[PDB]
């Protein structure tokens, strides 16, 4: 019967592509935190204060203060929940590297969990559209 597969591929693909949608969101969170350390990494110079180099302080997107950076070896980091925490060059090197693949994998299964909801939304609807 054509009536089943027809109502199905629709309501497979609705929730299906949502997963291809809900797949790619989290690999979208990778480059944010992937580029992070690399910035710190070109910065990190060991046995030196990290960011000891030449800099121009970013106050805003209009104003900058060209300034002599070198601080203590630390990176104050954003943990969310309005708690900033002050890490050092390694914790940072760790914390921020950790946040990379946590964006990488949430791609997979968050797509996957509804990948059988795409079918269950589907198969629930195909009887639901036919018999009703």
């Amino acid at each position: 019967v054509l009536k089943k597969l027809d109502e199905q591929y629709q309501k497979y693909k609705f929730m299906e592509l949502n997963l291809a949608q809900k797949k790619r969101r989290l690999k979208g969170q990778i480059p944010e935190i992937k580029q992070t350390l690399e910035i710190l990494k070109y910065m990190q110079k060991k046995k030196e204060s990290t960011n000891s180099m030449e800099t121009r302080f970013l106050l805003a997107d209009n104003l900058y203060c060209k300034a002599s950076v070198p601080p203590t070896d630390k990176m104050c980091l954003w943990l969310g929940a309005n708690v900033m925490l002050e890490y050092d060059i390694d914790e940072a090197q760790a914390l921020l590297e950790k946040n990379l693949s946590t964006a990488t994998k949430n791609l997979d299964s968050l797509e996957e969990d509804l990948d059988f909801l795409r079918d269950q939304f589907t198969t629930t609807e195909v009887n639901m559209a036919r018999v009703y």
Binding site: F57, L58, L59, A60, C76
Partner: protein, 107 residues
């Protein structure tokens, strides 16, 4: 005549609205502006307290950081009056032009 007396009731009823929630927002802004003081006031002396507005957080001493921040409280406390003053004045205006609509109708 009436049109200019119609025009003030419209210009009021639209602009009387916003000031009413505007005072409300600042009453809120007074709070964290005060509360963001207490949280660093909670640390009795902290010079690794960073007062900063945006992205940059510059190191300062909590003291003037608080002196700012009871004013920031106050500043965020302030316009509520103006924003209540702007409020109460307009409701008085909408009926005036509403009246000279009606009395000049009757005359």
């Amino acid at each position: 005549a009436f049109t200019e007396l119609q025009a003030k009731v419209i210009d009021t009823q639209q602009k009387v609205k916003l000031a009413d929630i505007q005072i409300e927002q600042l009453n809120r802004t007074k709070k964290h502006a005060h509360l963001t003081d207490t949280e660093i006031m909670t640390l009795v002396d902290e010079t690794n307290m960073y007062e900063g507005v945006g992205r940059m957080f510059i190191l300062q001493s909590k003291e003037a950081i608080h002196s700012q921040l009871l004013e920031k409280q106050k500043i965020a406390e302030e316009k509520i009056k103006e924003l209540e003053q702007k409020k109460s004045y307009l409701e008085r205006s909408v009926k005036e032009a509403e009246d000279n609509i009606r009395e000049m109708l009757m005359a």
